[PDB]
Amino acid sequence: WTATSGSCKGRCFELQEVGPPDCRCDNLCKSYSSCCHDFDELCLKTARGWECTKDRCGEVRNEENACHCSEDCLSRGDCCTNYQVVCKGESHWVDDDCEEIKVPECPAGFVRPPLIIFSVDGFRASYMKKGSKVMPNIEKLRSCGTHAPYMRPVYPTKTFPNLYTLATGLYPESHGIVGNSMYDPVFDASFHLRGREKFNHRWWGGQPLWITATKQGVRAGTFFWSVSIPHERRILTILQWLSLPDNERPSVYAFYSEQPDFSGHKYGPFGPEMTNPLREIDKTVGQLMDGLKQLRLHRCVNVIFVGDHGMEDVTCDRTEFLSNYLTNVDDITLVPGTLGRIRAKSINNSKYDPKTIIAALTCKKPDQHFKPYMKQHLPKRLHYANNRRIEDIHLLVDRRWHVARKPLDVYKKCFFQGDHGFDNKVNSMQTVFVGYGPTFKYRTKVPPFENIELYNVMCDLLGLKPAPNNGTHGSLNHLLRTNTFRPTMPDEVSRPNYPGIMYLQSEFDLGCTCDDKVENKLEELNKRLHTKGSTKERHLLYGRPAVLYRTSYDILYHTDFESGYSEIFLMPLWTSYTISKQAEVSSIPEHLTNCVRPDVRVSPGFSQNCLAYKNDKQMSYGFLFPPYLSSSPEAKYDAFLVTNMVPMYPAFKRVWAYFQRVLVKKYASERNGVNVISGPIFDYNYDGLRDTEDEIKQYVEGSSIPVPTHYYSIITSCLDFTQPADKCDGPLSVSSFILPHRPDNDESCNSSEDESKWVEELMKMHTARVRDIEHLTGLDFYRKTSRSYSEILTLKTYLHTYESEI
Numbered sequence: 132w133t134a135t136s137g138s139c140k141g142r143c144f145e146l147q148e149v150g151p152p153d154c155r156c157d158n159l160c161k162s163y164s165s166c167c168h169d170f171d172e173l174c175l176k177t178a179r180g181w182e183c184t185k186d187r188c189g190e191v192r193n194e195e196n197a198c199h200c201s202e203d204c205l206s207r208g209d210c211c212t213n214y215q216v217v218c219k220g221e222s223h224w225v226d227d228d229c230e231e232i233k234v235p236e237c238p239a240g241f242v243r244p245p246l247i248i249f250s251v252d253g254f255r256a257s258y259m260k261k262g263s264k265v266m267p268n269i270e271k272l273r274s275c276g277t278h279a280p281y282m283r284p285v286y287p288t289k290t291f292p293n294l295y296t297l298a299t300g301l302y303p304e305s306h307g308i309v310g311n312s313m314y315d316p317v318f319d320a321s322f323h324l325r326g327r328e329k330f331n332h333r334w335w336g337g338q339p340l341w342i343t344a345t346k347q348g349v350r351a352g353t354f355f356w357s358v359s360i361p362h363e364r365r366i367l368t369i370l371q372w373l374s375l376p377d378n379e380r381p382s383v384y385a386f387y388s389e390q391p392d393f394s395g396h397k398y399g400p401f402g403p404e405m406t407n408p409l410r411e412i413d414k415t416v417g418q419l420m421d422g423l424k425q426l427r428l429h430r431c432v433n434v435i436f437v438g439d440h441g442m443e444d445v446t447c448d449r450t451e452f453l454s455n456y457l458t459n460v461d462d463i464t465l466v467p468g469t470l471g472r473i474r475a476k477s478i479n480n481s482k483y484d485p486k487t488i489i490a491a492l493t494c495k496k497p498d499q500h501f502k503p504y505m506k507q508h509l510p511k512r513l514h515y516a517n518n519r520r521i522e523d524i525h526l527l528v529d530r531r532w533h534v535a536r537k538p539l540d541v542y543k544k545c546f547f548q549g550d551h552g553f554d555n556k557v558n559s560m561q562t563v564f565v566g567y568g569p570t571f572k573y574r575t576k577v578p579p580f581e582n583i584e585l586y587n588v589m590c591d592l593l594g595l596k597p598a599p600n601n602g603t604h605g606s607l608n609h610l611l612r613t614n615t616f617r618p619t620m621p622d623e624v625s626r627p628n629y630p631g632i633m634y635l636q637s638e639f640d641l642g643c644t645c646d647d648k649v650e651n652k653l654e655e656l657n658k659r660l661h662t663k664g665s666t667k668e669r670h671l672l673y674g675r676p677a678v679l680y681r682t683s684y685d686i687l688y689h690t691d692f693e694s695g696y697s698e699i700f701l702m703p704l705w706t707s708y709t710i711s712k713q714a715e716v717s718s719i720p721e722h723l724t725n726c727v728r729p730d731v732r733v734s735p736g737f738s739q740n741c742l743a744y745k746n747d748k749q750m751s752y753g754f755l756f757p758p759y760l761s762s763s764p765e766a767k768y769d770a771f772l773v774t775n776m777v778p779m780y781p782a783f784k785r786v787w788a789y790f791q792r793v794l795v796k797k798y799a800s801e802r803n804g805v806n807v808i809s810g811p812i813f814d815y816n817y818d819g820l821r822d823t824e825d826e827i828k829q830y831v832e833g834s835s836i837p838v839p840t841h842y843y844s845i846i847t848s849c850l851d852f853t854q855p856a857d858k859c860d861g862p863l864s865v866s867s868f869i870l871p872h873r874p875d876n877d878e879s880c881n882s883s884e885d886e887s888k889w890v891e892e893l894m895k896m897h898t899a900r901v902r903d904i905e906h907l908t909g910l911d912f913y914r915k916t917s918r919s920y921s922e923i924l925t926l927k928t929y930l931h932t933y934e935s936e937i
């Protein structure tokens with residue numbers, strides 16, 4: 132109940148929210164059905180339109196007008212945005228040459244450059260180039276300010292998850308808005324685009340920029356606009372707020388456009404009808420910048436032009452129906468469309484089984500346009516599992532397609548030609564970032580980056596301390612002229628032991644054998660050198676990883692590789708080795724096929740054993756440093772140490788052996804040498820964070836050998852590939868992956884074929900940032916390079932996507 136008897140008189144677009152039943156006059160009241168009786172008449176004036184014409188100049192103030200062209204309008208802060216152009220001979224902002232803004236030029240009483248976030252829904256990154264002819268205002272912001280060729284959204288590439296990720300720096304699994312539609316089984320409550328539950332605070336986790344600002348004494352304009360408030364009015368409202376007295380005036384503002392998403396859904400991303408919405412958005416930008424220029428704020432304000440996600444061609448005919456796969460289609464609830472989420476229709480149904488549902492959905496049709504996953508098996512780069520609102524069963528839908536439960540859902544709910552939601556590495560889902568103002572750089576292009584990184588920068592722009600988030604603070608310092616945040620490397624928590632030879636071969640009873648009993652001071656002094664680190668500069672190029680948690684581990688040196696061996700987990704946390712362009716691949720000699728060798732630097736009690744693998748009928752083993760890449764037949768024996776062994780399902784060994792025998796050499800040839808760091812990951816509770824020893828759900832049968840959920844590799848080389856990986860003088864280049872360690876290759880529908888047809892495609896799907904591996908391992912990489920730390924942070928957030936040209 133709202134008693135709408137009060138008045139909006141002198142309260143139009145007031146900043147403080149007033150609770151029921153006193154009537155509201157803020158930009159949200161429409162959505163709440165709570166506006167005072169006179170809100171429209173007083174606050175939403177439209178009379179005479181939005182532009183001054185010659186004859187309006189000098190007019191006597193008529194209060195009924197939408198905006199004014201009277202002589203007092205500048206000081207009332209309520210001129211039409213084109214007033215100075217029409218009435219005072221000024222130019223439109225877009226027509227002025229751009230000139231570097233070296234320092235803020237703010238009027239008196241401005242304590243900091245204000246920040247204006249201009250967010251556009253469904254603005255696909257390629258619009259910046261493809262519509263540049265019809266968007267001169269946006270093209271000027273882009274060419275004169277700082278821009279990326281594209282910004283990567285979060286998964287799913289839906290509106291509410293991405294806008295709230297923009298506001299918080301958080302993955303949707305952490306902020307809680309994991310779709311536009313959700314069911315929370317703890318609340319027993321549903322979040323819908325339609326209705327009042329979505330307003331309830333309990334859906335919205337983390338701390339959005341406007342709350343961060345407010346808690347730290349920086350006032351914010353409201354970010355939310357009721358759909359019926361016309362864009363011209365939203366702009367006039369911002370400009371009016373910017374004329375408030377100093378103590379009242381917000382420092383951060385947001386504008387939001389429903390376009391081009393609205394038309395893109397109807398017409399497709401490049402429908403001929405899309406030119407007009409792009410023009411209109413440009414005009415709105417022109418209005419804002421002209422209005423800032425009148426207020427003398429156009430060289431004071433930092434403006435961010437940012438999208439939530441792109442738009443792909445999708446039509447009704449490209450829909451896959453679960454009724455063509457499942458017999459029990461009525462025992463399931465599906466969240467449908469460009470992603471699928473499946474749960475039981477009824478909690479009282481004990482004949483519901485996710486395993487038979489996944490199996491009925493796996494590789495069933497030749498050209499199947501979706502792939503099912505238990506959420507824990509989704510690519511770790513999606514970070515989409517650790518929330519109770521995310522259903523256990525997930526369908527990743529191919530770009531251009533939908534999934535639906537039954538055909539009746541698609542015709543009794545073609546209409547649409549565009550949609551979004553797909554995998555966030557898809558080219559069509561990329562969106563835009565432009566920053567313009569005194570704090571951003573001048574005419575600077577920056578590499579693509581992820582939207583989770585912006586919250587930190589928006590905090591930096593406002594002098595705020597960000598709440599804890601998933602951005603990596605300092606990774607976007609290269610966007611900024613000043614206000615850079617100067618991070619320090621994390622302190623190493625555990626120091627390594629450097630074991631020498633401490634055990635005799637007969638102290639070991641590991642059930643392993645090796646045909647290695649074959650035999651010289653020339654070569655013996657030499658192998659002693661290798662075991663103390665004499666080749667360590669070749670194989671460990673960026674310093675040893677730092678261990679950021681409390682544990683007990685040994686550094687082990689070898690001719691061809693170095694490792695940090697965990698006495699707790701019984702295997703390396705990391706193994707580092709360099710493969711030059713000239714290196715040669717060899718096979719494992721016949722007599723060494725089953726060779727495992729005790730490591731005389733590491734006690735039997737802190738070693739694995741071969742008996743456990745013999746007795747575990749499901750589990751085999753692989754090696755982190757690959758015997759195929761040994762530098763010499765004698766160095767090969769090091770690769771068969773028990774301290775280089777890791778548990779691997781036979782099915783996973785197919786992937787791993789192809790990566791090690793074929794792909795590392797291929798990368799070394801292509802990149803002029805590579806440095807590889809590989810190791811295990813344990814994330815049994817799928818939170819994206821290193822498991823402690825007591826979280827491990829699976830061991831090699833009858834042993835204390837923990838089974839990894841994933842294996843990672845970080846592959847680094849010189850960005851200037853004319854220099855070899857091991858003699859690189861400048862910036863680095865990296866690609867990484869986090870491969871799921873699974874007992875089957877059900878994920879790969881072509882896995883019955885030769886690895887050359889399916890392994891690399893698997894690995895591409897599981898591409899990752901170094902930072903993702905850092906979270907999963909508690910390791911910090913690239914501690915000793917000649918590069919600035921900020922540049923290294925950027926490298927660690929890089930994701931190699933394998934998409935073609937945007």
Ligand SMILES: *[C@@H]1O[C@H](CO)[C@@H](O[C@@H]2O[C@H](CO)[C@@H](O[C@@H]3O[C@H](CO[C@H]4O[C@H](CO)[C@@H](O)[C@H](O[C@H]5O[C@H](CO)[C@@H](O)[C@H](O)[C@@H]5O[C@H]5O[C@H](CO)[C@@H](O)[C@H](O)[C@@H]5O)[C@@H]4O)[C@@H](O)[C@H](O[C@H]4O[C@H](CO)[C@@H](O)[C@H](O)[C@@H]4O[C@H]4O[C@H](CO)[C@@H](O)[C@H](O)[C@@H]4O)[C@@H]3O)[C@H](O)[C@H]2NC(C)=O)[C@H](O)[C@H]1NC(C)=O
Nearest residue numbers: 304305306307335336337517518519599600601818819906
């Ligand atoms: C991305 O960045 C984010 C932000 O930094 C990272 O998320 C953080 O990670 C931490 C580790 O997972 C986590 O810390 C925990 O905090 C618990 C208290 O949390 C509340 O308070 C904070 C602060 O205001 C608040 O933000 C939290 O909000 C969550 O939950 C609400 C309501 O459900 C949601 O609205 C909100 O969206 C958010 O949900 C997300 O996080 C939670 C986990 O907190 C998930 O469950 C959700 O699925 C969702 O992802 C909370 O309101 C605190 O209780 C924890 O401490 C336990 O464990 C430690 C072990 O060290 C121990 O010291 C304690 O004793 C305690 O153990 C006891 O509880 C156990 C579990 O119940 C029980 O088993 C034991 O027996 C004990 O009784 C813990 O410190 C932090 O909350 C989140 N923050 C956010 C915002 O999500 C994220 O990791 C980053 N991702 C990556 C990949 O890097």
Ligand SMILES: O=C(c1ccc(-c2ccc(Cl)cc2)cc1)N1C[C@@H]2CN(C(=O)c3ccc4[nH]nnc4c3)C[C@H]2C1
Nearest residue numbers: 248250252290294295297298311354355356385387392
């Ligand atoms: O009020 C806001 C808001 C604006 C900006 C920021 C914002 C957040 C962070 C920053 Cl940094 C800036 C602005 C925060 C909220 N709304 C209201 C709008 C309602 N809505 C949809 O109904 C909708 C739209 C497109 C879709 N496609 N498919 N389904 C769709 C459903 C989109 C919502 C956005």
Ligand SMILES: [Ca+2]
Nearest residue numbers: 814820821822
């Ligand atoms: Ca974990």
Ligand code: NA
Nearest residue numbers: 744747750751
């Ligand atoms: Na076995």
Ligand code: NA
Nearest residue numbers: 876877879882
């Ligand atoms: Na398969």
Ligand SMILES: [Zn+2]
Nearest residue numbers: 253290392396
């Ligand atoms: Zn949309």
